[PDB]
Amino acid sequence: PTHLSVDTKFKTEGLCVDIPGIPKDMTYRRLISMMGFKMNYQVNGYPNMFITREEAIRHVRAWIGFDVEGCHGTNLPLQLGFSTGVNLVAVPTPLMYKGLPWNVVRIKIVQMLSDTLKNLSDRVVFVLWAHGFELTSMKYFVKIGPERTCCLCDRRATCFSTASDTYACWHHSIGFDYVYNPFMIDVQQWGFTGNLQSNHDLYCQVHGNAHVASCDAIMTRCLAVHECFVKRVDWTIEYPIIGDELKINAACRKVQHMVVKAALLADKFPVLHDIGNPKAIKCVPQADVEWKFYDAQPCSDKAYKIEELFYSYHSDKFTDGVCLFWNCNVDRYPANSIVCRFDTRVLSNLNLPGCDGGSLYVNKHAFHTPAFDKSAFVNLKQLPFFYYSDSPCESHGIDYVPLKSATCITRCNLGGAVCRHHANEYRLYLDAYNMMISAGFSLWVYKQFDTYNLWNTFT
Ligand SMILES: O=C(NCCc1ccncc1)c1ccccc1F
Ligand SMILES: O=C(NCCc1ccncc1)c1ccccc1F
Ligand SMILES: [Zn+2]
Ligand SMILES: [Zn+2]
Ligand SMILES: [Zn+2]
């Protein structure tokens, strides 16, 4: 049970307004044939154009909401909308393009999908709320066949060119005119009552319905993300490395140890309340502090209410010492906090657009994160960059330019001249810091935090 059987039944009720008379009894095999495609009993890696929910979730990076609305059907112009906000008008002769024939529309589709997906995935998964026109329009821009490799590289082929009779991946498809071996899923097969807008609007207020095909395409993909990542959560599913995943996670671990160690040295809290990850380890193992853990899984729908996390009767007194919220998203942080909050607004290959302002952050696992809210941090301040070290000034073992920095909190800098070891360590740490920030993470600390209190730890 790996792929979706072509002999699986497809409910056609949602298709009968564009396609009147459609048989109630329908398989994927018959539907694909009706869409104008011939599979020829091919055992060559492409068993079905349609995929399961499980296969769709594994390939969330490939998701592109797609909707087709009749502007006037072989005789009428069609408006093709994509969750990228693009609207193309195909004539059979929020970006809105005027009517053009299919031979030019298909070139634009290949360019748009290649630019959106080359750094995300090896495929495209068209996420539909199928009514008919979108399925019958696929023959105009899609070619199918056996699984192939790119003409210029080892990646699988996602595009085809009728000019050169060649196949290309998303990175080498310039000038290509056909989408090759796409995948698709119809959200209406999941069992919903009512139309797209009524189901989407139950969980999201950020996407509106301007009555254009891209609006519906956006709502469709948002609803699919809500069903698969918000109301249902599977953190076991692994996702491939496509960018700076390893460096970001390593930087996150370096920054957490640095910031927590310095906060304990500067304000000598007798107790730390570590709220979040049920699998958390002490990030500063040598610290004197009483380390107490509280379990909370990552919230994917709304941010946790601090009243529910802390009250209803543990040290009980969270007000004593400091609270560490490392990627634990709460509505309003207490004043005595050390916080790392992922900013859902960040533009990156890891962060996909999500539901109701939130974003789907995909790094080893998929985490739908609730919308970033600046008010969550009213009792805190932004944590400034600093590097702290009490390790001995000793090189051991990359050329050098002398480091001068007020934020290099070391015994050598206190003594008036940064040593080579602490300069190399400072520069490596600043790189890890910038990587973590640029990835979308934001750091916040209790208002009394002052790095001036770290200089007296060298006496
Ligand atoms: O937002 C991004 N990617 C679009 C994903 C997407 C869009 C529309 N419909 C489905 C999926 C992005 C932004 C900045 C950098 C890299 C990115 F990948
Ligand atoms: O949930 C995340 N990370 C798994 C460990 C974890 C942390 C905190 N609370 C529970 C669990 C996570 C979510 C969004 C962005 C970055 C992340 F690291
Ligand atoms: Zn290639
Ligand atoms: Zn939405
Ligand atoms: Zn030094």
Going along the chain from its start, the domains and CATH numbers come out as 13-148+181-230 (3.30.420), 245-457 (no CATH)
Q: Is 204 annotated as a binding residue?
A: yes
Provide the H-helix boundaries in 45-195: 53-58, 102-117, 133-136
Query: Amino acid identity, residue 45?
Result: G
Pocket of ligand 2 contains residue 46 by CB under 6 Å: no
> After which residues is the backbone of the chain broken at C–N > 2.5 Å?
72, 93, 313, 397
CA-nearest of 411, 407, 412, 445 to 427 is 407
Residue 330 pairs with which residues in a beta bridge?
304
3-class DSSP assignment, residue 110: helix
Short-list 36, 361, 81, 51, CA closest to 196:
81
* 186 is annotated as an active-site residue: no
What DSSP string describes 227-294?
IIIISS--S-------SSHHHHHHHHHHHHHHHHHHHHHHH--SEEEEEE-TT---SSTT--SEEEEE
User: How far is the C-alpha of 220 from the C-alpha of 187, rounded, in Å?
Assistant: 8
* 349 Cβ inside 6 Å of ligand 1: yes
Active site residue 425: no
Q: How far apart are the CA of 258 and the centre of ligand 2, in A?
A: 19
- State whether the Cα torsion 192-198-200-203 is positive or negative: negative
Calculated CA dihedral for residues 176, 111, 355, 209, nearest 10 degrees: -110
- Residue 134 among the catalytic residues: yes
Nearest-CA neighbor of 4 among 126, 159, 166, 185? 185
The answer to whether 69 is a known catalytic residue is yes
Distance CA 395, CA 233 (A): 47
Cβ neighbourhood burial of 238 (10 Å; 0-12, 13-18, 19+): exposed
Q: Is 216 a catalytic residue?
A: yes
322-326 sheet: strands from edge to edge: 290-295, 271-276, 322-326, 337-342, 441-446, 380-382
The helix/strand/coil state of 308 is helix
Please report, for residues 146, 383, 425, 432, the alpha-carbon distance to residue 428 in angstroms, rounded to integers and kept in the order given: 47, 19, 5, 6
Sign of CA dihedral 310, 316, 319, 320: negative
DSSP-assigned states of every residue in 150-180:
-SSSSSBP-EEETTTTEEE-TTS-TT--EEE
Structure tokens at 23: 């048989």
44 within 8 A of 68, measured Cβ to Cβ? no
Relative to the CA of 252, which ligand 2 atom is closest?
18
Q: Exactly one of 69, 186, 356, 425 is catalytic; which is it? A: 69
- Has 211 been labeled as part of a binding site? yes
Tokens representing residue 255 in the block: 């920054």
Tell me the torsion sign for CA atoms 40, 43, 46, 49.
positive
The CA distance from 86 to 76, in Å, is 20
Structure tokens of 237?
Answer: 């599913």
Q: Is the CB of 361 under 6 A from ligand 2?
A: yes
Pocket lining: 297 vs ligand 2, CB cutoff 6 Å: yes
Report resolution (Å) to 1 decimal: 2.0
Q: Which residues of 410-419 are buried (b: 16+ CB within 10 A; e: fewer)?
A: bbbbbeeebb
Q: Which residue has the tokens 């498809």?
A: 173
Neighbours of 401 (CB within 10 A): 7
Name the DSSP letter for residue 375.
G
Q: How far is the CA of 373 from the centre of ligand 2 (A)?
A: 17
Q: d(Cα 183, Cα 50) in Å, to the nearest integer?
A: 6
Method by which the model was determined: X-ray
Centre of ligand 1 to C-alpha 343, Å, is: 15
Beta-carbon contacts of residue 45 (< 8 Å; ≥ 6 apart) = 146, 147
Ligand nearest to the CA of 354: 4
- Helices 420-438 and 245-267: crossing angle in degrees, nearest 10, is 110
Alpha carbons 140 and 205: distance in angstroms, whole number: 34
Strand partners, 326: 340
3-state secondary structure of 80: strand
Are 197 and 209 in contact by the 8 Å Cβ rule? The answer is: yes
Tokens 């304990």 correspond to 264
Q: Are 360 and 353 in contact (CB under 8 A)?
A: yes
275 within 8 A of 325, measured Cβ to Cβ: yes
Q: What is the DSSP letter of 14?
A: G
Distance 443 CA to ligand 1 centre (A): 24
Phi, psi of 434 (to 5 degrees): -65, -35
